[PDB]
Ligand binder design. Structure first.
Ligand SMILES: Nc1ncnc2c1ncn2[C@@H]1O[C@H](COP(=O)(O)OP(=O)(O)OP(=O)(O)O)[C@@H](O)[C@H]1O
Ligand SMILES: Nc1ncnc2c1ncn2[C@@H]1O[C@H](COP(=O)(O)OP(=O)(O)O)[C@@H](O)[C@H]1O
Ligand SMILES: Nc1ncnc2c1ncn2[C@@H]1O[C@H](COP(=O)(O)OP(=O)(O)O)[C@@H](O)[C@H]1O
Ligand SMILES: Nc1ncnc2c1ncn2[C@@H]1O[C@H](COP(=O)(O)OP(=O)(O)O)[C@@H](O)[C@H]1O
Ligand SMILES: [Mg+2]
Ligand SMILES: [Mg+2]
Lengths: 128, 145, 1622
C-alpha cells in the first residue's frame, strides 16, 4: 500500500536522527551525596528507558513495512497513530505543550537525548 | 416555569408544564436540554403538532453541543450567547443588565463605582481573548462575578 | 485416657448448662450470655477437632463425631436465635408503643401478631426447660427459627414508609439507616441500646449520661470522655416518646453550652489584658470547661481586647494599646507552651494544643494590625478578620455570641462538637474563611476547588466547627441522583446542618443539572430568613423538596469540594455554578502548618524542625525516582507531624521508665531539655516514608536525610517479641524466615514495616509485582499478632473488580427507594453492629485486586480522617478503631493522587521474595504434606532429597529460569507461572512412583531407580514448564542450554531435541515417537470429531495436559484458531475419568454471570458448618469448566477484565462471594481449563500476570506440513477404501490437499479480511466432504475423485472470499494443484468450471448439470410460491450456486450459516426456499420498537422447545437488524457453539422443559428419567435440529467488530460471501 511505503521511509529516517546510546550514571558512595548527580541520574534513567522503547518500536515498524514480522495489536495501534501523525501515547513520557504532533516530538526528543549523552559523558569522563 | 432536564421527574414535569402553558399563555424554560438529546427529538415532534396560546413561549437553554438534534435546531430560533465582542460591547451589556434604579440610589458616587466595575469587568473578560498573555489560564470570569 | 476425659468434660458441661433467662417487661424470658454460649461451643468444637489429630482418636471416634454433630447443631440454632430475638425486641416495641401503626399498616400489624405469637410460644417452652440440650431437641426448632428469621425480615422491610414518617418528627433520624432507626424506635425503653446510635445523629455526642433509673438524661458525653452536664435535666418519664425527649436533649445541649459559655467568658476576661497569668488558675479554667468553649472563650476575649484598643486609638496619634493586646497573647502563649513541655492528661493536652493554635493566629493577626498602623475599629484589615462579640445582656442565651467576618454575621449554633482536631489557621485558610462566609451572607454555597490534599474538606468543616454547626461530609459518586440528593437536603434543611459534598463532580452531568433546582429553591428560602420584614413569630420558612413543603433552618449550608483537574469528571452546568462561590485552594502553607503543629506538641526547636521537614518533603518529590505509589503532599507531611508527637510522648515515657529503675531523679523540665527532637522527627519520617521506597531510592533518601539533618541516625527497634512469633508462624506455614541479610530477611523486614503502617494508618496499600510475597506478609502478620497480643485476627478478602460496583457498595432502589447493602458495606456494617463480638477482634478488610478511581474513590471519606463510609441513602458508617482497610495490588497505574495520598504504602519488589525462598517452600511442603490425602510421604521425602541439589541457588532450575526469560513466549513470562507448573509436574512424578508401587506390590521402586527417574523427570518438567508456552524453535533452544549446564544424563541422539523424549518409570529416556503408531482408521470414522490421529505433538501435549489436569491445576491452551486445543484437551480428558467437562464460550461481553449460570445448572450450594460449599451435582466427579476464548472479554479503561478477576479469585482463594446474601462460597471438585488465541491477535487482550501465576500455559501450534500429511494421509487411506480402485491415489490426494491448503493460508490472512482464517478445520471438513460424497458410490473414476476434491475446495476456500481477484486466484490454483499431483487425467471431465453437486435430481450427492438444475429449481419455486411465499424470483447463475451452498449446511449437524451481502439480494428468501426444500421450519423473531431482551429469551425458549423436545428441524433465520442489544448475541454465541444456553430455562420454565423432554425422549424409545440425562438429550436434539442463519451487510468495521462480540459466528458458522449482485 501507499501508506506502507511512506511510513517505512519516515521510520527509517527517524532512526537516523534519534541517537542510539545513553549510558547510565555510575552510582558512587560520594556521588549519592551530590544533589546534582541525584537529579541528573533520574534524567538518564528515565531517558534511557524512553530511548530504547522508541527505537525498538520504530525498528518493528520498519520490519513490519518490509513484510518481515506480523502486525500485532500494539503495532496496529502504533502504526495507526503514525499514519495520522498523532504522537503515540506510549512515547509520551515527559510533559509537552498540548497539540504537539509526532514530527515535532521526534526532533524534540532527539535534541533531549543529545544533551543527556553529554551529561553522562561528563560524569563518565571527569566525574560528577 | 423553569425546569432542569436531567432528572426523570424533570421530564414528567416538563411535559405537564408545557401542556398547561400551551392552554394559558404561560412561559416555560427548560435548562441544559443538551443533556437529553434523545428526549429533545421527541419534544420537537410534540411541538410540531401543537397550536398553543398566542402568548405561550418555550425557552430551551443548552450549551453549544453537537449532540443537539438538527431537527430541533431547524424548528426553533437560535440565539448565541458568548463573550461580548469588545470592551465597548461588554460595558453596554453590563449597563443594560443592571436596573437604572440600582445605580441611581442616594449616594451620587455610586454611579462612578458601577462604571469602574463595568470597565474593570470588561478589561478582565476581554483579556481572556488573548488566551495566554491576558491571563495564564482561561478563567470563567462571568455574570456571577 | 486423656481423650476420655475430654469427652467426659464435654458431656458434663452440656448436661447442666442452662440458657440464662431474663424477664423482658413481664412478657417473656429472653436469653443473655451470647458470648458465653458461643465461646463455649467454639472451645469444644476446637477441642473435638484437635483431638482427631491424636493417634488415640480411633477408639473414641464415634463418640467425638456424635459431639461434633451436636455442637455444630447448637451453633446453627443459636446463631439464628440471637438474630431472631434481637429483631423481635425492637419490632415488638414498635408494634406495641405506637397504636397509629396498626391503622397505617394493618396487614403488617396482623402478620407481626401471628409471628409474635409463635415466638412467645417457643419462649415459654424454653422457660420450662432452659437446658441447652432440651432446647436443641425441640421438634423442628431449627426450622422454626429459620422461618422466624425470614418472616421477621419481611416485616422489617415493610416498615419503610412508617420510618419515613418518624424521620420528620426528629429530623436527625434522616441520617440513620432504616434498621438502626427501628432499633432506636423499638428500644425506646431500653436506653442503653441507644448509645451506639448517637454518633450518627450528632456531631460530637457519642453517649448520654443517665441516672441510676435511666429515666432522666443528665447530660451528654463525647467519644473522648468529655462530659457536658445539663443545667436543666431532661426527664424521659414525663416525655416518654422517643422523638420528644430526643428533641429536648438537643435543645438542652444548645442551652447548656450557651450558659456554660457565658460563665467561661466571665472568667477568661480576667486572663485577658492581664500582665501576669498564674498557670495553676489558667489550667484550672481550661479543665473546668469544654474544649470547644475554651477556644471560643479565648477568641471572644481577644476580639474584645482588640475592639477596646482600636476604640482608644480613634485620634490616630494616640498611643497604641494594641501592644498590650499582643503582650497578653505573648504571656498566655508562653504559659501554654510551658504546659505542653511537660506531661499532661490526654484531654487537657489536646485542649492546650487547640489554645496554642488559636493564639498563634491571634498573635499573627495582632502583629499584622500593629505593623499596618491600624487605629480604627472600622478599618477593613480588622473587619476582614473573624471577630467574636459577646453580649451578656442579651435575653436569649442562644444569641449572646455573634461571629462576624467582613459584613457576614453569624450566630453560634452551639452544637456539641466534642474534641475536634483543629486546623492551623493559615493565610490560605484565612482566605477560605473570608470567601465562604461571603457566600453564606449572600445565601450562596461554597465551592472550594483544587488538587487533592490541599485542605478543601477540612477547611469547610473547620469553618463549620468555628460557627458551632453540625457539618456532614458526603463522599459523592454517580449513585447520588436527584432523589438521593433531595432527601439529604431535606435532612440538612430541617436539622440546620451543613452539607459538605466532596467529589461533587463525580455525579452525572444530568444529575448535576437536576440538583441545581433543589439547591436554588433552598437558597431562596434562606433569603427569606434574612428579610428584615419577616418576623420569627410567623409561618416558618419552607421550600419545596421532592414535591413536599420542607421547613428550612437558617443555620444550614451547602458546600461542594471538587478537583476540576481530574479528567473524566462531570462538568458542572453554569446554572448550578452560579449558585456557588468558588475559591482556589492549590498551595497549602506547609511550613506554617508544620511550625504550629510542632510548637503545639511541645517541640522546643519547632521553628528549626519546620524549616527542615517541609523542604525535605519537597526534595523527596524531586530527588527520588518517580513512582505511582509515591506521595509527599500535605497528608504525608501531616502523618509525619502527628507521628512525631506520638514518638515524642513514648520517648518521654520511656526515659522516665528508665528513671524509675535508676534512681528517683524525675525532672520533667530537664527531661525535655535533653531530648533529641531531630531524631524523633527522623524516626517518624522513616517509619512512614521508607516502606514505600523502591530499593534504589532507599540510599537516596538517607543521603537527603543526612543533608538536612546532619549527624542524626535512624535505628529501628529490634522487635524481638514480634519476630519470635513471626518465626514460629513461618515454620507452621512452610515459609522461610530470615534476619537481616539471610534468606528471607528482606521479606521479614517488609512484614515488620507493614506492622508499623498498621499502627499509624487505618488504610494502607501493599504494592508490588505478582509474586512478591505481599499476601503471605499480611497473612503471617495477622496470625503472629493473634499469638503475640491475644486478639483474634479476622481477614475479609474482597476482589473489588470481580463484581460490579453496585454489588461492592450497594444499590438504592429506583422506585421503592430501599437500600440494599453491597459486599463491602455488608462486611463493615456487620463489624459495627458487633452482634458476635466483631469489635473485640482485629478486622482486616483486604481489597485484593485492581485499583481504579471508579470504585476506590468511594472510600475517600473512609481512608481520610473522616473515617466514614457515606451512602447515597444518607447513611454514614463510622470506621471502628479495630478495622484496617488494606489494598493488595500489583500496580497503581490507574489510581489517582486522592487515593494514593490517603493510604500508607508498603512497596514489595520481586527481590523481596527470592527464588530460593520459593524453592524452600515447595520442598518443605513436599516433605510434610502428603499428596495422597506414610508410604506416599516416604516417596515424596526421598524424592525431595533427590531434587534438593538442583533447587539450590545458582542450581539447574535457577539457571534454566534465567535463560527462559530471554526467550520468546506466546504469553508474558512470570517466575511463578513456571515454578507453579514445575511444582505441579514434580508432584505428579511422585504420584507416578506410588502408582508403580501399586503395580508392583512385591518390589517397590528402589532409591537407585527412584534417583534415576527423578533427575530425568525434573529435566523433562523444566522444559515443559519454561518453554511449553513457546514455539518449537524456542523449546529446542532451551534444550541445548540445559544440555550444556546440566549433569543429568540426557538422550545421546545427534539432532533430536530433548523435548522429543519422555521419561519412563524405569528412569530411562524413551523417545515420544514410540507412542506414535501409524494407525489405520475405521472407514466410518474418517475425520470424525472424536478421532485423533497420533502425532508427535498430540502425544506430548496430551501427557502434559494429563499431569496438570490430574492435579486439578488450572491451565490455558494457547494457539491459532483450529490448532487442536479443544481436540487435545478432550483427548486427554478421555484418559482421565471421574471428570466432566462443561464448555463455556467467552465473548467480548462475557461477565462472571455466565460462569454463575453454569454453576446453577451443574452444581449445588449446600450449607456446611464451615460455610457454603459449591460442588457438582454428580458425586465423585470433578467438574471442568472449559473456557474457549478466555482472553476475549472486554478490558475496561483501567486494564481489568471482570471475569478474569473472578476466575483468579476462584483459583487463588478457592471461591467467590454470593452477591445475593454477601456470603463467601467455597468451591469443591471444580477446576478450570482455558483456551485462547495469542494475545497479539485482534480482539485479544493479554491476561493479567496475577491470573497467569496460577495457570500454566501450553502453546499448541498448527501442525506442520509433515504432521498434516500424517494426519490426513491416514484419513484419506481410510476414506479411499470405499472405492478399492482409487486406493493408489491416496498419497497424491493428501499432497494436493496439503499444498492447496498451505497456499490458501499464506495467500489470504487476517490482514486482508477478518474472517480469512484457514486451519486444519478446513482440512477436516475437506476430507469429510469428500467422504460424504463417496459413501453411496459403488465405483468412481479418478477424474470423478478430482471433481469432488475440486468442488469441496471451492466450498471451503472460495465461498468466504470478498473480492473477485481472490476468487479468481482460488479458482485457478485449484486447477494448478490438481494437475501437479494428478497427471494423466482428462482435465475437462474433472475440472469443468461450473462444478455443481446436488442430491436433488437423484438419491445421491452426485454432480448436476447447470441447466438440469435450473429447470428443477424453477419447478420447485413454482410450488414454493403457492405454499410459502408468493414473491417471484428471477433465477440467475449465482442463485443456483447459492441455493446449493445453503442446502449443504442444512444437511449437516449444527449447520449454521453466516450469509453476508447487501440488503435485498435475496439472502433471507433463498434461505427460506432452501429450508422449505429440506423440510426445515422457518423461525424469525418478530421484532418491533418495544422488543426487548426477555422477549428474545422467550423467543429462544420457543425455538429450543420445538427443536429440542418435538424433534422439529428449524431454520432460525435472524438478521443483524434483529440484534437490538448486545445481549442478544451473547445468547446466540453460546447457542451456536454448545447447542444450549445455561441460564435460559430457569424456575418454572426448566420444570416445564423437563416434562417436555421426558415426553419427547419417550417418543424416541430412550429410557431417560434423570434431569441431567434429559438435558443432555435435549442439547443433542438442538444440535442436530436447530439451524441458525445469520444475515448481515458487508461492513469492514462492523465485520471485524462482529468477531469479538460473537466469535462463534466465525468458527461455528459457515460463511458465504454473497456480497452484491455482480
Ligand atoms: N516468606 C516466604 N517464604 C517462602 N515462600 C514464600 C514466602 N512468601 C511467599 N512465598 C511463596 O511464594 C509465593 C508468593 O505468593 P504471595 O501470595 O505471597 O505473593 P503476592 O505478591 O501476594 O501475589 P499476587 O501478586 O499474586 O497477589 C507463593 O507461592 C508463596 O507460598
Ligand atoms: N490548615 C491546616 N492545618 C492543619 N492540617 C491541615 C490544614 N489544611 C489541610 N490539612 C491537612 O491536610 C490533609 C488534607 O486535607 P483535606 O481537607 O482532606 O484536603 P482536600 O479536601 O483538599 O483533599 C489532612 O490531613 C488535613 O488535616
Ligand atoms: N492429530 C490430529 N488428529 C485429528 N485431527 C486433527 C489432528 N490435528 C489437527 N486436527 C484437526 O484440527 C482441528 C482442530 O480443531 P479444534 O481442536 O477445535 O481447534 P482449536 O481448539 O485450536 O480451536 C480439527 O479439525 C481436527 O480434526
Ligand atoms: N433473485 C431475485 N429475483 C427477484 N427478486 C428478488 C430476488 N432476490 C431478492 N429479490 C427481492 O428482494 C426482496 C428482499 O429479499 P430478501 O431475501 O429479504 O433479501 P436480503 O435477505 O438479501 O435482505 C424479495 O422480497 C424480492 O422482492
Ligand atoms: Mg477533600
Ligand atoms: Mg497476593
Amino acid at each position: 500500500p501507499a501508506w506502507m511505503r511512506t511510513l517505512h521511509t519516515t521510520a527509517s529516517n527517524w532512526l537516523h536522527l534519534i541517537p542510539q546510546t545513553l549510558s547510565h550514571l555510575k552510582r558512587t558512595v560520594e556521588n549519592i551525596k551530590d544533589p546534582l548527580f541525584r537529579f541528573f541520574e533520574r534524567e538518564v534513567k528515565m531517558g534511557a528507558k524512553l530511548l530504547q522503547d522508541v527505537r525498538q518500536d520504530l525498528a518493528d515498524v520498519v520490519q513490519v513495512c518490509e513484510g518481515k514480522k506480523k502486525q500485532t495489536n500494539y503495532l496496529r495501534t502504533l502504526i495507526n497513530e503514525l499514519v495520522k501523525g498523532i504522537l503515540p501515547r506510549s512515547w509520551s513520557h515527559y510533559t509537552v505543550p498540548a497539540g504537539m504532533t509526532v514530527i515535532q516530538w521526534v526532533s524534540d526528543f532527539s535534541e533531549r537525548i543529545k544533551q543527556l549523552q553529554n551529561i553522562s559523558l561528563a560524569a563518565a569522563s571527569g566525574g560528577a | 416555569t423553569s425546569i432542569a432536564i436531567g432528572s426523570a421527574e424533570g421530564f414528567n414535569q416538563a411535559d405537564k408544564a408545557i401542556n398547561t402553558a400551551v392552554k394559558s399563555g404561560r412561559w416555560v424554560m427548560l435548562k441544559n436540554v443538551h443533556l437529553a438529546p434523545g428526549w429533545l427529538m421527541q419534544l420537537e415532534k410534540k411541538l410540531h403538532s401543537l397550536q398553543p396560546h398566542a402568548c405561550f413561549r418555550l425557552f430551551l437553554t443548552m450549551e453549544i453541543n453537537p449532540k443537539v438534534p438538527v431537527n430541533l435546531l431547524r424548528a426553533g430560533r437560535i440565539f448565541v450567547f458568548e463573550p461580548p465582542p469588545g470592551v465597548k460591547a461588554n460595558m453596554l451589556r453590563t449597563f443594560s443588565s443592571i436596573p437604572v434604579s440600582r445605580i441611581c440610589k442616594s449616594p451620587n458616587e455610586r454611579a462612578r463605582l458601577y462604571f469602574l466595575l463595568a470597565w474593570f469587568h470588561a478589561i478582565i473578560q476581554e483579556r481572556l481573548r488573548y488566551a495566554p498573555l491576558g491571563w495564564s489560564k482561561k478563567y470563567e470570569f462571568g455574570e456571577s462575578d | 485416657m486423656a481423650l476420655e476425659e475430654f469427652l467426659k468434660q464435654i458431656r458434663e458441661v452440656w448436661n447442666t448448662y442452662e440458657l440464662d433467662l431474663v424477664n423482658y417487661q413481664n412478657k417473656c424470658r429472653l436469653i443473655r450470655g451470647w458470648d458465653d454460649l458461643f465461646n463455649k461451643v467454639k472451645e469444644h468444637i476446637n477441642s473435638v477437632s484437635a483431638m482427631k489429630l491424636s493417634p488415640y482418636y480411633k477408639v473414641f471416634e464415634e463418640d467425638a463425631l456424635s459431639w461434633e454433630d451436636k455442637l455444630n447443631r447448637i451453633m446453627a440454632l443459636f446463631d439464628v436465635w440471637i438474630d431472631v430475638q434481637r429483631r423481635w425486641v425492637y419490632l415488638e416495641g414498635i408494634f406495641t408503643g405506637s397504636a397509629d401503626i396498626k391503622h397505617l399498616l394493618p396487614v403488617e400489624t396482623q402478620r407481626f401478631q401471628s409471628i409474635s405469637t409463635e415466638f412467645l410460644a417457643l419462649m415459654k417452652k424454653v422457660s420450662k426447660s432452659p437446658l441447652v440440650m432440651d432446647v436443641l431437641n425441640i421438634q423442628g426448632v431449627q426450622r422454626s427459627l429459620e422461618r422466624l428469621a425470614d418472616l421477621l425480615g419481611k416485616i422489617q422491610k415493610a416498615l419503610g414508609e412508617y420510618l419515613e414518617r418518624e424521620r420528620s418528627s426528629f429530623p436527625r433520624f434522616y441520617f440513620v439507616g432504616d434498621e438502626d432507626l427501628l432499633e432506636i424506635i423499638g428500644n425506646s425503653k431500653n436506653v442503653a441500646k441507644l448509645q451506639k446510635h448517637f454518633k450518627k445523629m450528632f456531631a460530637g455526642v457519642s453517649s448520654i449520661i443517665l441516672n441510676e433509673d435511666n429515666s432522666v438524661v443528665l447530660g451528654i458525653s463525647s467519644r473522648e470522655g468529655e462530659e457536658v452536664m445539663f443545667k436543666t435535666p431532661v426527664s424521659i418519664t414525663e416525655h416518654p416518646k422517643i422523638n420528644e425527649w430526643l428533641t429536648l436533649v438537643e435543645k438542652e445541649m444548645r442551652v447548656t453550652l450557651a450558659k456554660l459559655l457565658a460563665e467561661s467568658v466571665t472568667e477568661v476576661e480576667i486572663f485577658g489584658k492581664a500582665t501576669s497569668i498564674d498557670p495553676n488558675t489558667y489550667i484550672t479554667w481550661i479543665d473546668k470547661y469544654q474544649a470547644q468553649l475554651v477556644v471560643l472563650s479565648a477568641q471572644i476575649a481577644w476580639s474584645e481586647n482588640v475592639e477596646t484598643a482600636l476604640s482608644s486609638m480613634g485620634g490616630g496619634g494616640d498611643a497604641a494599646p494594641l501592644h498590650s493586646v499582643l503582650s497578653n497573647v505573648e504571656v498566655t502563649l508562653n504559659v501554654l507552651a510551658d504546659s505542653v513541655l511537660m506531661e499532661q492528661p490526654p484531654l487537657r493536652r489536646r485542649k492546650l494544643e487547640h489554645l496554642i493554635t488559636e493564639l498563634v493566629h491571634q498573635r499573627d493577626v495582632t502583629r499584622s494590625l500593629i505593623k499596618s498602623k491600624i487605629d480604627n475599629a472600622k478599618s477593613f484589615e480588622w473587619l476582614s478578620q473573624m471577630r467574636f462579640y459577646f453580649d451578656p445582656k442579651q435575653t436569649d442565651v442562644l444569641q449572646q455570641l455573634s461571629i462576624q467576618m467582613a459584613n457576614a454575621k453569624f450566630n453560634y449554633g452551639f452544637e456539641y462538637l466534642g474534641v475536634q482536631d483543629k486546623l492551623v489557621q493559615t493565610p490560605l485558610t484565612d482566605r477560605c474563611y473570608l470567601t465562604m462566609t461571603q457566600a453564606l451572607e449572600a445565601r450562596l454555597g461554597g465551592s472550594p476547588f483544587g488538587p487533592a490534599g490541599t485542605g478543601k474538606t477540612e477547611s469547610v468543616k473547620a469553618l463549620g466547627h468555628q460557627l458551632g454547626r453540625f457539618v456532614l461530609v458526603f463522599n459523592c459518586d454517580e449513585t447520588f441522583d436527584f432523589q438521593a440528593m433531595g432527601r439529604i437536603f431535606v435532612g440538612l434543611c430541617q436539622v440546620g446542618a451543613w452539607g459538605c459534598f466532596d467529589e461533587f463532580n463525580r455525579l452525572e452531568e444530568r444529575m448535576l443539572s437536576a440538583v441545581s433546582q433543589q439547591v436554588q429553591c433552598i437558597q431562596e428560602a434562606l433569603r427569606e430568613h434574612s428579610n428584615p420584614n419577616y418576623d420569627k413569630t410567623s409561618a416558618p420558612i419552607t421550600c419545596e423538596l421532592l414535591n413536599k413543603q420542607v421547613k428550612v433552618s437558617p443555620d444550614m449550608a451547602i458546600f461542594i469540594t471538587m478537583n476540576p483537574g481530574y479528567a473524566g469528571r462531570s462538568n458542572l452546568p453554569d446554572n448550578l455554578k452560579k449558585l456557588f462561590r468558588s475559591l482556589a485552594m492549590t498551595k497549602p502553607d506547609r511550613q506554617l502548618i508544620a511550625q504550629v503543629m510542632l510548637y503545639s506538641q511541645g517541640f522546643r526547636t519547632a521553628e528549626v524542625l519546620a524549616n527542615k521537614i517541609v523542604p525535605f518533603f519537597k526534595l523527596c518529590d524531586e530527588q527520588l525516582s518517580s513512582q505511582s505509589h509515591y506521595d509527599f503532599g500535605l497528608r504525608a507531611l501531616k502523618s509525619v507531624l502527628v507521628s512525631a508527637g506520638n514518638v515524642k510522648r513514648e520517648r518521654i515515657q520511656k526515659i522516665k521508665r528508665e528513671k524509675e529503675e535508676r534512681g528517683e531523679a524525675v525532672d520533667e523540665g530537664e527531661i525535655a531539655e535533653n531530648l533529641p527532637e531531630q531524631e524523633i522527627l527522623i524516626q517518624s519520617v522513616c517509619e512512614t516514608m521508607v516502606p514505600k521506597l523502591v530499593a534504589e531510592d532507599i540510599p537516596l533518601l538517607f543521603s537527603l536525610l543526612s543533608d538536612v539533618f546532619p549527624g542524626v541516625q535512624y535505628h529501628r527497634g529490634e522487635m524481638t517479641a514480634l519476630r519470635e512469633e513471626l518465626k514460629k508462624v513461618c515454620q507452621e506455614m512452610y515459609l522461610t524466615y530470615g534476619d537481616g541479610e539471610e534468606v528471607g530477611g528482606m521479606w521479614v523486614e517488609k512484614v515488620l514495616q507493614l506492622y508499623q503502617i498498621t499502627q499509624i494508618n487505618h488504610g494502607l496499600m501493599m504494592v508490588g509485582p505478582s509474586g512478591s510475597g505481599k499476601s503471605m506478609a499480611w497473612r503471617v502478620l495477622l496470625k503472629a499478632l493473634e499469638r503475640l497480643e491475644g486478639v483474634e485476627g479476622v481477614a475479609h478478602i474482597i476482589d473489588p473488580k470481580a463484581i460490579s460496583k453496585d454489588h461492592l457498595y450497594g444499590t438504592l432502589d429506583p422506585n421503592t427507594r430501599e437500600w440494599t447493602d453491597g459486599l463491602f458495606t455488608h462486611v463493615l456494617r456487620k463489624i459495627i453492629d458487633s452482634v458476635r463480638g466483631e469489635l473485640q477482634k482485629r478486622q482486616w478488610i483486604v481489597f485484593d485486586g485492581d485499583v481504579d478511581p471508579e470504585w476506590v474513590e468511594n472510600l475517600n471519606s473512609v481512608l481520610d480522617d473522616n473515617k466514614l463510609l457515606t451512602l447515597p441513602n444518607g447513611e454514614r458508617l463510622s470506621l471502628p478503631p479495630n478495622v484496617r482497610i488494606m489494598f493488595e495490588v500489583q500496580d497503581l497505574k490507574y489510581a489517582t493522587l486522592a487515593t494514593v495520598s490517603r493510604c500508607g504504602m508498603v512497596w514489595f519488589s520481586e527481590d523481596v521474595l527470592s527464588t530460593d525462598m520459593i524453592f524452600n517452600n515447595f520442598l518443605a511442603r513436599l516433605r510434610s504434606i502428603p499428596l495422597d490425602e506414610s508410604p506416599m510421604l516416604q516417596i515424596q521425602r526421598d524424592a525431595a532429597t533427590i531434587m534438593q541439589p538442583y533447587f539450590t541457588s545458582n542450581g539447574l532450575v535457577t539457571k534454566a529460569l534465567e535463560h527462559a526469560f530471554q526467550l520468546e513466549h506466546i504469553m508474558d513470562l512470570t517466575r511463578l507461572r513456571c515454578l507453579g507448573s514445575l511444582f505441579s509436574m514434580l508432584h505428579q512424578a511422585c504420584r507416578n512412583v506410588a502408582q508403580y508401587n501399586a503395580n508392583h506390590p512385591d518390589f517397590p521402586m528402589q532409591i537407585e531407580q527412584l534417583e534415576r527417574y527423578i533427575q530425568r523427570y525434573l529435566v523433562y518438567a523444566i522444559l515443559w514448564s519454561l518453554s511449553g508456552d513457546s514455539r518449537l524453535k524456542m523449546r529446542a533452544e532451551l534444550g541445548e542450554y540445559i544440555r550444556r549446564i546440566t549433569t543429568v544424563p540426557l538422550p545421546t541422539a545427534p539432532n533430536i531435541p530433548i523435548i522429543d523424549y519422555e521419561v519412563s518409570i524405569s528412569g530411562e529416556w524413551s523417545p515420544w515417537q514410540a507412542k506414535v503408531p501409524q494407525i489405520e482408521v475405521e472407514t466410518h470414522k474418517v475425520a470424525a470429531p472424536d478421532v485423533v490421529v497420533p502425532t508427535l505433538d498430540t502425544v506430548r501435549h496430551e501427557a502434559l495436559l494429563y499431569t496438570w489436569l490430574a492435579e486439578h491445576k488450572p491451565l490455558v491452551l494457547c494457539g491459532p484458531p483450529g490448532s487442536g486445543k479443544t481436540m487435545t484437551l478432550f483427548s486427554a480428558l478421555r484418559a482421565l475419568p471421574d471428570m466432566e467437562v462443561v464448555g463455556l464460550n467467552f465473548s467480548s461481553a462475557t461477565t462472571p454471570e455466565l460462569l454463575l449460570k453454569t454453576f446453577d445448572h451443574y452444581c449445588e450450594y449446600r450449607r456446611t458448618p464451615n460455610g457454603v460449599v459449591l460442588a457438582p451435582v454428580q458425586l465423585g466427579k470433578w467438574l471442568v469448566l472449559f473456557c474457549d476464548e478466555i482472553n476475549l472479554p472486554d478490558m475496561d479503561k483501567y486494564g481489568t477484565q471482570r471475569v478474569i478477576s473472578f476466575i483468579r479469585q476462584m483459583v487463588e482463594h478457592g471461591g467467590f462471594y454470593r452477591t445475593s446474601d454477601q456470603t463467601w462460597v467455597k468451591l469443591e471438585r471444580i477446576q478450570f481449563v482455558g483456551a485462547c488465541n495469542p494475545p497479539t491477535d485482534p480482539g485479544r487482550k493479554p491476561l493479567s500476570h496475577r491470573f497467569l501465576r496460577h495457570v500454566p500455559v501450553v502453546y499448541v501450534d498448527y501442525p506442520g506440513p509433515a504432521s498434516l500429511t500424517q494426519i490426513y494421509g491416514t484419513f484419506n487411506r481410510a476414506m479411499l477404501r470405499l472405492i478399492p480402485s482409487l486406493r493408489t491415489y491416496a498419497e497424491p490426494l493428501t499432497a494436493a490437499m496439503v499444498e492447496f491448503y498451505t497456499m490458501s493460508q499464506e495467500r489470504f490472512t487476517q490482514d486482508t479480511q477478518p474472517h480469512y482464517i484457514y486451519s486444519p478445520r478446513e482440512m477436516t471438513r475437506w476430507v469429510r466432504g469428500i467422504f460424504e460424497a463417496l459413501r453411496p458410490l459403488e465405483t468412481l473414476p479418478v477424474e470423478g475423485l478430482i471433481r469432488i476434491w475440486a468442488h469441496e475446495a471451492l466450498r471451503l476456500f472460495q465461498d468466504r472470499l470478498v473480492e473477485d481477484e481472490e476468487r479468481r486466484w482460488t479458482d485457478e490454483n485449484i486447477d494448478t494443484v490438481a494437475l501437479k499431483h494428478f497427471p494423466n487425467i482428462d482435465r475437462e471431465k474433472a475440472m469443468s468450471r461450473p462444478i455443481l453437486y446436488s442430491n436433488w435430481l437423484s438419491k445421491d450427492y452426485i454432480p448436476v448439470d447447470q441447466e438440469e438444475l435450473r429447470d428443477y429449481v424453477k419447478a420447485r419455486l413454482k410450488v414454493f410460491y403457492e405454499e410459502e411465499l408468493d414473491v417471484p424470483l428471477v433465477l440467475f447463475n449465482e442463485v443456483l450456486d447459492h441455493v446449493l451452498r445453503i442446502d449443504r449446511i442444512f444437511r449437516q449437524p449444527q449447520g449454521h450459516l453466516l450469509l453476508i451481502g447487501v440488503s435485498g439480494a435475496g439472502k433471507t428468501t433463498l434461505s427460506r426456499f432452501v429450508a422449505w426444500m429440506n423440510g426445515l421450519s422457518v423461525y424469525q423473531i418478530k421484532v418491533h420498537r418495544k422488543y426487548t431482551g426477555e422477549d428474545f429469551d422467550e423467543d429462544l425458549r420457543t425455538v429450543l422447545r420445538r427443536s429440542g423436545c418435538k424433534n422439529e428441524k428449524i431454520a432460525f433465520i435472524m438478521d443483524e437488524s434483529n440484534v437490538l442489544d448486545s445481549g442478544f448475541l451473547e445468547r446466540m454465541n453460546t447457542l451456536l457453539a454448545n447447542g444450549e444456553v445455561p441460564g435460559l430455562f430457569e424456575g418454572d420454565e426448566y420444570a416445564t422443559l423437563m416434562t417436555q423432554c421426558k415426553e419427547g425422549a419417550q417418543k424416541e424409545g430412550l429410557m431417560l428419567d434423570s434431569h441431567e440425562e434429559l438435558y443432555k438429550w435435549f442439547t443433542s436434539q438442538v444440535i442436530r435440529n436447530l439451524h441458525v442463519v445469520f444475515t448481515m451487510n458487508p461492513s469492514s468495521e462492523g465485520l471485524k467488530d462482529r468477531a469479538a462480540t460473537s466469535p462463534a459466528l466465525f468458527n461455528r458458522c459457515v460463511l458465504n460471501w454473497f456480497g452484491d449482485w455482480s
